[PDB]
Paper text:
Here we investigated the aminopeptidase, P. aeruginosa aminopeptidase (PaAP) from P. aeruginosa, which is highly abundant in the biofilm matrix. PaAP is associated with biofilm development and contributes to nutrient recycling. We confirmed that post-translational processing was required for activation and PaAP is a promiscuous aminopeptidase acting on unstructured regions of peptides and proteins. PaAP contains an M28 Zn peptidase domain (residues 44–116 and 274–510) and a PA domain (residues 117–273).
We determined the elegant regulatory mechanism whereby the C-terminal propeptide region of PaAP binds in a groove between the protease and protease-associated (PA) domain, blocking access to the active site pocket. The structure of PaAP reveals the C-terminus binds in a groove between the PA and peptidase domains, which blocks access to the active site and locks these two domains into a closed conformation. The C-terminus is a propeptide sequence that binds between the PA and peptidase domains, inducing a closed inactive conformation where the active site is occluded. Although PaAP shows substantially increased activity after C-terminal tail removal, full-length protein is catalytic active, with lower kcat. Productive substrate binding to the closed conformation is unlikely given the active site and metal occlusion when C-terminal tail occupies the active site and inhibits PaAP. It is likely, therefore, that the full-length protein is sampling open (active, C-terminal tail away from the active site) and closed (inactive, C-terminal tail occupying the active site) conformations when free in solution.
Author numbering: 36 to 510, 526 to 536
Amino acid sequence: WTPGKPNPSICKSPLLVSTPLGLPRCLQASNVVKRLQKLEDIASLNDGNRAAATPGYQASVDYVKQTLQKAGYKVSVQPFPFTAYYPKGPGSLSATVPQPVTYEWEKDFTYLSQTEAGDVTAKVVPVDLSLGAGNTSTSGCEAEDFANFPAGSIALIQRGTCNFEQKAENAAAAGAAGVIIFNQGNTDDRKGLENVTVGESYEGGIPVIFATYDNGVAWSQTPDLQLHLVVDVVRKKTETYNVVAETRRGNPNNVVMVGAHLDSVFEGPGINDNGSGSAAQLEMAVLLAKALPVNKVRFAWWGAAEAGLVGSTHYVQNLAPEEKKKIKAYLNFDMIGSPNFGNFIYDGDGSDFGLQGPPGSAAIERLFEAYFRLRGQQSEGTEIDFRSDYAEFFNSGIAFGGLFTGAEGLKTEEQAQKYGGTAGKAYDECYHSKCDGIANINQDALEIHSDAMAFVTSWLSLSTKVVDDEIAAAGQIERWGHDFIK
Ligand code: NA
Ligand SMILES: [Zn+2]
Ligand SMILES: [Zn+2]
Ligand SMILES: [Zn+2]
């Protein structure tokens, strides 16, 4: 294996590692890479993944817990029940009456993530539609929408206003056999397919699929229409875990919290996504055992993020109000080793994309911006509309920030000039795939972003004054993780 050099002598000074000048120098990329190799090995021993409710995830939990305990931490493994969702094969959709049509998988229609399986054929009944440009559909949002609905029918429901889960559960309570949700069509951009979910909490029991706007319109204009609908999936009630630890030292009423989800997708080992955030954060926690922070630092490794941020969301929701209020800031680290990386910082002040985090998120962003500038490196903004485990912290008004090296987006010519790599190719062409292994890590990306992680965590562990100032001066959700919830 490739050893790094021994840590410079400043790394045993409890003073120097308590500062944003010492902590990053002590966080060596070579040491993070060895933790990434261990997670790669854990994946190889457990069918090639570290997904929620697998032995690969359990062995990941064991490794994080053991490492933390070796550093003196008391570790809290926090279990929670969790309904897993497994897509088995492609879906089927065809009209039988008044004429036979076969519709095209992943062009005409697609699954709602977290749907139940099903094989049904029934009359299709449109429910409270509002077609046409500029509409503000509330189709299926209210129980009264279904006063007309004849049980056993397939509900044809238009996207709009409320969550897909709400639409589908209302349809179920009215005795629908299945649900077809079609894109709203209120603008010419909302007429295709989308990545959409009915959520891990879905209790409707019937299958739910998504379709194009012009399909839903045509089906709504077909009297006596019957569709043959097949969804090939499985859902199972299981258990997974978050791993939480915090420093003994530090003010427990002004907690700086850092998080990184520990699960992979089922399709691969998840080494960049998100072994990289998990491993870098673990190395930092080990170093911070020696520090003398002013503010307590809490570390979290989240379960089941790939199922829609289930672990992180559950942790925040379960805090008593007095406990929630002790968390001054949350820092999220999800994918920081992308092979074709850019240097992306969460756009906390909304300067790039128009969405602002809770007060104090702008100051956290400015600290990340400062570190990259300090190092002679470029950086730029990335979106913060509830795509990662900061989402419930965001929803709760807690200041947050984070770093990102890029996923399925394509690198521009300008970004290639700023960061190197290849313009025209994804930041991580192996995102959510089998090839997201140890070989998929860019160690340059991983080093600068771990250093930047250490810098801002250290800073806030000494003083949250920049967050506190923005909080004093200050005195909808379409996405939740990978998919849209409405
Ligand atoms: Na309605
Ligand atoms: Zn991730
Ligand atoms: Zn992911
Ligand atoms: Zn910004």
